[PDB]
Amino acid sequence: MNMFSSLSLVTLLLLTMPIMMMSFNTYKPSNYPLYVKTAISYAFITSMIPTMMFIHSGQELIISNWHWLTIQTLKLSLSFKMDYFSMMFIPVALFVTWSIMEFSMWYMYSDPNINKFFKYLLLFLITMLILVTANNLFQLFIGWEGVGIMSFLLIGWWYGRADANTAALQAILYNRIGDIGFILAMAWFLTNLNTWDLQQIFMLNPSDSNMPLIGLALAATGKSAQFGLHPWLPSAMEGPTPVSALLHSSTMVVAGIFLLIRFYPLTENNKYIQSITLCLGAITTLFTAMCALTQNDIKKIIAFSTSSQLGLMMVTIGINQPYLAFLHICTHAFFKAMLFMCSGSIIHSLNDEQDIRKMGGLFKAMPFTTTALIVGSLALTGMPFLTGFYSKDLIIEAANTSYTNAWALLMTLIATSFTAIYSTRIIFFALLGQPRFPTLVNINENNPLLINSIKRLLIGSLFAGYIISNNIPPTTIPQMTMPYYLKTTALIVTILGFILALEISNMTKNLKYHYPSNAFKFSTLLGYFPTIMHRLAPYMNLSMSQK
Amino acid sequence: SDAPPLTLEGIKDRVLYVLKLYDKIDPEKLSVNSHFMKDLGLDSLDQVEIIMAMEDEFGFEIPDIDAEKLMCPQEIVDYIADKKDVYE
Amino acid sequence: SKMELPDYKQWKIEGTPLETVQEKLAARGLRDPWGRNEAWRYMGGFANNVSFVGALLKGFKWGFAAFVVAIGAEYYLESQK
């Protein structure tokens, strides 16, 4: 108990101690970059001690450790919600962060402001952890903005690049829009209900919670980059790759779904939210892949490749799977973030080249890079027993074997195969074929530090996702019984994506001229949603402002 | 990215070696300062192809206006040396 | 530093598809002006490369060989109780 709670709160305060050392003193320069990493390394250990106790005891502890404010009949505190999600989502985030931690200590050697770089990387981590552990909307709101702001600087690290300034505000524009539902939700729980503490919210079990949940639906629309407020998520790839690896691949993007899960007791009864959320992911989960089938940017493609995974997570919640969707969060983060780092290896040896068509001949010229690229893809595509398959097979269970919209299941599998399609298009140019990079060879990855970074993040997907399944205790009645094809439909359509893309990929070798096609451009040009909605809408708001 | 250094002496053959694979030139007649149109008996349309190879060779675009005047290998070296600020 | 630049006649189209363009160019009545330019994309140590099938099967020989031993060891470690 005491030991469990006490040792748990150290991580949030422990992580902040290096930050307190940046605003004060000048004792030891040139060593902070390692200082932070070891703290996470140490933090991870203190993030695993709660792991043991929680699994054995399942001790969900809400700790109110202050009396901040008090209005008539309200009270705010700097409390934390030590429960399943924090105990199980924190270890993964640090694990990924720990990998990314040492990844960035090498890639950004070209930045004199590297020390500043870490002055914010550690900041975001703090806010994200506070967000998930938050017991109240307000404190939860704070993290909802910290991720919003910490992204602003990290997104726009190179403030000179016009893409950063435009993209950074594009996301901030969207990120703020999502909060409209968030602030609305607080108002409703303050008017109809009377508090922002989840204890009262769940226990009272609202009978008409359409409005508060509708705000939650909007919250995830922009923050998690769902369709309708999606375009910004790819836009983050105009800046540092390590920055994209954590914020927009593993940590910030998970915010949108997280709130719905954290309000699981309320979301169950109202199916109005479920349908639109179920449909919202449906339109997004394919619109991301449908667009992604022909995109030609290594970093953006990964963003779209991440987008579809996120788009499907909403469907997982849309099918009323509270704790099963949670797994998809951790499982996806491992490799995809590693893929960002792997994409870093490609960009490193390429000396600032990113076009997918300017890559190849890397199977043996990039042996280590080739090593982990397939696992993430195979795990991403749903290779059995791998980190991504567990969710992919499990998640498709209820959706295809429980009450769901007819059209909802339609795009559910069409894009599912597309998930593997671009992976083959990627590993093809990335690894298959003879080299196509510029004449001079800058290829070198005999860097021990990165190998440590790749080592740590290569292992987790292979084994950690498998391990994570065992310890977690029962919370649901698994639908182990279903028609064999439905149980194996993923096991049926999975191989189709590789082959179908392989059918598409190899026929392009032949020396035959090309032919334009509208759909080839509709998906390639992002469905024209960004190309249009990011011209007129700025023009409407601004060109019409003067009058 | 450790260090991608650049040296004028090392770059010397990089511009010239590009010409060493051309199928419209005798390698031995070619010189460091040889004008392409007259000394090498070439044309602007032929000269366009050489300029393009430098972009695949080194990896950086070339403006249309300044591409034409680079009729001397030294000038091409000057463009590469001067644009990247390489002096030794 | 010195970056010894090898011979410039090493790059060639013989035995590689680069000349297959030349062969088809006879019907086209032309020739590639840069025939020797891009011979490296198939020369210099890039002749053989495992295709898609090989990529997934990278290194599976050793794991496949060791996999059979591991599964049998269960029978070895289970038959004797």
Partner: peptide, 17 residues
Amino acid sequence: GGGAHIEPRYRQFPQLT
């Protein structure tokens, strides 16, 4: 940076280890 333990090539397979 141990004294350029890898010597880059030009149009060649990498000087790996």
